[PDB]
């Protein structure tokens, strides 16, 4: 209800007033990083990781220990994505949508690595350090115990999302589709079928149990093949930092607490923006671009999360923006009627901006949907 600054300040007090004295020593090499950090952190106690990080970069000349701290958290946040560990996959090309690999069991100790990552993420939040692993917003929603919605499906699996749109808005009794309350699952060539409800192996989906079947299938997509691994991550995280400490945050604020912010050069953002049904001179967009100028970079980067799904830009700027099909630039269009709000589609980096009446209307209704919707 309150602002992000208050949520940040209150969370900093919890870590300050619950910190053990002295320091922990962690020594790593450039080439051993993942597996020195895995051994030493998983051999320490959860509460021990709460004492000052005294990182030893073997081979270097240790001076600035805050910078090696910022460095070690960033480099390790990218070393957990190594294909050799089979812990993570991507729902799209060019590293779009980072989600847990359901085939992580091919790593026999995988639950022990996920408990390790949970601790590593908790250490970053506890010590005010940032990561860049690239967890999706539904992943942060699970940490906040928020239930993933239908909108989140369009962010991680648009084709799965289009199937549920089609089911909801079509009388499937005319179109003639036998659907039951079941779902298959191929993990490592082993095909398994999950029952959505009690005895769903036998129950057709009709016009009546449809909206139910929709609440079920959505919840299955966010949990299938990842129940083990998610439990390991949260258990290791809760050991170091209690999960209740994040009760005030939302999924977009939690990403800010873990990834940080950049100043968003919109001389770049403006020139790398395409449109439907609009011109670069439509008084709508001439208003929109002037709104985003008066924004501070709090809400500027919140607009990025609302439209693109994350707060992190690619290294190439806004020209190398990637969607669920590959390179996809920032886009705005004429979608929605006058008494709507800005809705988005993160898989396309699209901002459905209805043609508003006045700048007063558009500065007012934009910031609300940016700050109160998803």
């Amino acid at each position: 209800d309150r602002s992000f600054r208050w949520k940040y300040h209150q969370f900093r007090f919890l870590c300050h007033s619950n910190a053990l004295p002295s320091h922990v020593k962690i020594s790593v090499s450039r080439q051993t990083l993942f597996e020195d950090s895995f051994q030493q952190i998983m051999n320490m106690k959860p509460y021990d990781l709460r004492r000052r990080l005294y990182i030893i970069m073997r081979g270097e000349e240790g001076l600035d220990y805050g910078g090696i701290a910022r460095e070690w958290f960033f480099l390790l946040s990218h070393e957990v994505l190594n294909p050799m560990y089979c812990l993570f996959e991507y729902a799209g090309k060019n590293n779009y949508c980072l989600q847990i690999n359901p085939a992580s069991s091919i790593n026999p100790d995988h639950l022990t690595y996920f408990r390790f990552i949970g601790r590593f993420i908790a250490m970053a939040l506890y010590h005010g350090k940032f990561i860049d692993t690239g967890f999706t917003l539904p992943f942060y929603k699970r940490m906040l115990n928020k239930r993933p919605t239908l909108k989140d499906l369009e962010s991680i699996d648009p084709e799965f999302y289009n199937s549920i749109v089609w089911i909801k808005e079509n009388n499937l009794e005319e179109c003639g589709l036998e659907l039951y309350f079941i779902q298959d699952m191929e993990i490592l060539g082993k095909v398994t079928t999950h029952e959505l409800k009690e005895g769903g192996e036998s129950i057709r989906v009709t016009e009546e149990n449809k909206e139910e079947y929709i609440m079920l299938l959505t919840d299955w997509r966010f949990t299938r093949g990842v129940e083990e691994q998610t439990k390991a991550f949260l258990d290791g995280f809760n050991e170091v930092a209690p999960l209740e400490w994040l009760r005030y945050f939302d999924e977009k604020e939690l990403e800010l607490m873990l990834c940080g912010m950049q100043e968003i050069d919109m001389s770049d953002w403006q020139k790398s923006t395409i449109y439907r049904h609009y011109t670069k001179n439509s008084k709508q967009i001439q208003w929109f671009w002037q709104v985003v100028k008066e924004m501070d970079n709090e809400k500027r980067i919140r607009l990025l999360q609302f439209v693109t799904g994350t707060c992190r830009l690619p290294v190439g700027g806004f020209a190398e923006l990637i969607g669920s099909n590959g390179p996809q630039k920032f886009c705005i269009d004429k979608v929605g009627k006058e008494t709507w709000l800005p809705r988005s589609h993160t898989c396309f980096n699209r901002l459905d901006l209805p043609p508003y009446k006045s700048y007063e209307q558009l500065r007012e209704k934009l910031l609300y949907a940016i700050e109160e919707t998803e």
Binding site: R5, Y8, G67, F130, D132, G260, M261, D296, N297, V315
Partner: peptide
């Protein structure tokens, strides 16, 4: 790659402050 994460600590700190 320090400029990557360093720019993110600076922008974040200037907002809070």
């Amino acid at each position: 790659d320090p400029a990557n994460w360093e720019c993110r600590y600076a922008a974040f700190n200037c907002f809070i402050q």
